[PDB]
Design a protein around this nucleic acid. Structure first.
Ligand code: CA
Ligand code: CA
Ligand code: CL
Ligand code: CL
Ligand code: CL
Ligand code: NA
Ligand code: NA
Ligand code: NA
Ligand code: NA
Ligand code: NA
Length: 287
DNA sequence: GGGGGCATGCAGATCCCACAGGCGCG
DNA sequence: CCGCGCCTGTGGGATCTGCATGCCCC
């Protein structure tokens, strides 16, 4: 269907915005636990169509409101997780979140085998949870004080294809237009920010795209891959996402963005009339 | 028949996004 | 001189992540 999302683009978007959760909460009855596995993407409700298209591609998950500005797709039901696992086995994540998925998959197998009901089975879930995301809370640490290891292998993966990069960029990327006054100057920029735990992957964008720069700051837990040279934006960045379509509102930013690139390519941004259309397109992107 | 799991949420923490200014270089 | 773009810097909210529990069903 027209609303289907390329499975690599979906994995790339998951690498950007998704989250694998393992909730282990006290249940009342003596020493019983709620055990909840989940995959979640929460967005501004201006991008609810993304979540609906993902739900339509996978045929699992429930869309819910969060506040008045946000909306999330949550996959949680036991059989629904098998569809998540089957997709990610075949279209694997490449950021550090691969580690979280693999622990999530490991907890799933523990629960599918009913091992978390045996006398010494919840401790295994706690051990898995401690390695996921932000690890254990204080309460779980007090109830399982012997579970201290957060060691897990670091993920080292290459960008698999442009479909993945389109999904990743649709999440964590940015296409914007700069105007600077010395004459009013125009500048197209492309940037992706990311936590330094994936510094190798972000570094590799320079090779994979044949342009750009990695900036880190002298302060900083996150870095930026950025392209500021116009001919790199025109000859390398724009063709890559023409071949691999972005999703959500960022595709609209891109389409507006390229319209500015066409104007500047024709040198028609120097024209006072050409610059005035650039200001209009930019005012439209602010929406 | 107690719990395991679902349905359906709410709440906290931070990693992003969409930028701006200074300035050298060709 | 001039325009490009390398390089530094960042506010704050859209993300990422964690927390909650009554109901259903075997
Ligand atoms: Ca991200
Ligand atoms: Ca995003
Ligand atoms: Cl949820
Ligand atoms: Cl983290
Ligand atoms: Cl223990
Ligand atoms: Na949710
Ligand atoms: Na950015
Ligand atoms: Na170039
Ligand atoms: Na956007
Ligand atoms: Na984090």
């Amino acid at each position: 269907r027209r609303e289907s999302i390329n499975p690599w683009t979906l994995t790339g978007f998951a690498d950007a915005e998704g989250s694998f959760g393992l909730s282990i909460l006290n249940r009342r009855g003596t020493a019983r636990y709620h055990t909840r596995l989940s995959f979640t993407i929460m967005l501004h409700n201006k991008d609810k169509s993304i979540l609906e298209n993902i739900q339509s591609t996978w045929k699992v998950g429930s869309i819910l409101n969060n506040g008045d500005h946000y909306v999330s797709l949550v996959v949680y039901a036991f059989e629904d997780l098998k569809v998540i696992i089957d997709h990610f086995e075949k279209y694997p994540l490449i950021t550090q979140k691969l580690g979280d998925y693999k622990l999530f998959k490991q907890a799933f197998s523990v629960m599918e085998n009913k091992e978390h009901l045996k006398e010494n089975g919840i401790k295994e879930l706690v051990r898995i949870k401690a390695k996921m995301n932000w690890g254990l809370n204080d309460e779980l640490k007090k109830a399982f004080p012997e579970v201290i290891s957060r060691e897990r292998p670091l993920i080292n993966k290459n960008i698999p294809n442009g479909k993945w990069l389109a999904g990743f960029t649709s999440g964590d990327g940015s296409f914007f237009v700069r105007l600077r006054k010395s004459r009013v100057r125009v500048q197209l920029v492309f940037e992706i920010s990311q936590h330094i735990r994936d510094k190798n992957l972000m570094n590799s964008l320079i090779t994979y795209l044949g342009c750009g720069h990695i900036y880190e700051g002298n302060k900083r837990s996150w870095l930026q891959f950025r392209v500021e040279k116009f001919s790199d934006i025109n000859d390398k960045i724009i063709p890559v996402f023409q071949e691999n379509t972005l999703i959500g509102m960022k595709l609209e930013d891109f389409e507006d963005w390229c319209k500015v690139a066409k104007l500047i390519e024709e040198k028609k941004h120097l024209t006072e009339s050409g610059l005035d259309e650039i200001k209009k397109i930019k005012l439209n992107m602010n929406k």
